[PDB]
Amino acid sequence: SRPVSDTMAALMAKGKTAFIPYITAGDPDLATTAEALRLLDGCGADVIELGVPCSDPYIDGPIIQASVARALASGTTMDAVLEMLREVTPELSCPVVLLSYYKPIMSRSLAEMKEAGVHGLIVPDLPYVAAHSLWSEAKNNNLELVLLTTPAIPEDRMKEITKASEGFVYLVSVNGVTGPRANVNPRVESLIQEVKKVTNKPVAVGFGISKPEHVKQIAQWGADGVIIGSAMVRQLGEAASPKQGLRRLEEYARGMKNALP
């Protein structure tokens, strides 16, 4: 797979928004996760966000919250995920971005991760104190650390964020937690511009997106990518069964993909 920064940069040269879906590793089970990764890839995922479950996913609404509990129950662990990606990534044409809270990745060497074929990593609650640590650690293992910025971040810290991030800038669309939301926050419109004004890094928007008109709007506004999670879990994870679940994901993923062309 080509690097995330690379994948993002090629898209923007052709003036396009990246389709970046997100599912929870282990929901329903690692075996279903794999297959799902291929569907999304076959559907058009330019980048795939894979969530690693942890005991306290607090920057997550109830939909993902439920997705994690299932993940833990089925027996998913960081060790297992990578083992799963190691044999699956060589099949994926797009890079995979691992997403997990600081807790599960603090006392861990990032070598095993790069071995699994993972390209990027996102840590929502990354303490300001360990930020340079993880940062130096990621780049030493050729893992692009994707930092987030939300509406609450002042103009100046946002510039710093944009400068230290790698792969793309994860622009959180709201201050609340992950979850549906019927309308795209209006602040995102000007915020996108504000970010692209002080940085040439790819700018991707996340949180909320769960309808085509959302992807259509955020794209027209200039975003370089749209990240969609809760809406994607709601299809594969809450389905009455793995089988149906994958079907729904296929039907939903393709639908969100057409809203871009």
Curated annotation (Swiss-Prot):
Which residues of the parent protein does this chain contain? 87 to 347 of 347
State what protein this is by name. Indole-3-glycerol phosphate lyase, chloroplastic
EC number(s) for this protein? 4.1.2.8, 4.2.1.20
Gene for this protein? BX1
* Keyword entries, A-Z: Amino-acid biosynthesis, Aromatic amino acid biosynthesis, Chloroplast, Lyase, Plastid, Transit peptide, Tryptophan biosynthesis
Its recorded reaction(s) are:
(1S,2R)-1-C-(indol-3-yl)glycerol 3-phosphate = indole + D-glyceraldehyde 3-phosphate; (1S,2R)-1-C-(indol-3-yl)glycerol 3-phosphate + L-serine = D-glyceraldehyde 3-phosphate + L-tryptophan + H2O
Task of the protein: The alpha subunit is responsible for the aldol cleavage of indoleglycerol phosphate to indole and glyceraldehyde 3-phosphate. In bacteria, tryptophan synthase alpha (TSA) activity is almost completely dependent on formation of an active alpha2beta2 complex with tryptophan synthase beta (TSB), and indole is usually not released during tryptophan synthesis. In maize, the TSA homolog BX1 catalyzes the formation of free indole from indole-3-glycerol phosphate, independently of TSB.
Q: What else is known?
A: Mutant rescue experiments indicate the existence of a second tryptophan synthase alpha gene whose product might be involved in tryptophan biosynthesis while BX1 might be restricted to free indol production.
Q: What is its main location?
A: plastid
Self-association state and partner proteins as the record states: Tetramer of two alpha and two beta chains for the tryptophan synthase activity. Homodimer of alpha chains for the indole-3-glycerol phosphate lyase activity.
Give the subcellular location. Plastid, Chloroplast
Q: Which GO terms describe its cellular component?
A: chloroplast; cytosol
Q: Family per UniProt?
A: Belongs to the TrpA family.
GO molecular function ontology, one term from the record: tryptophan synthase activity
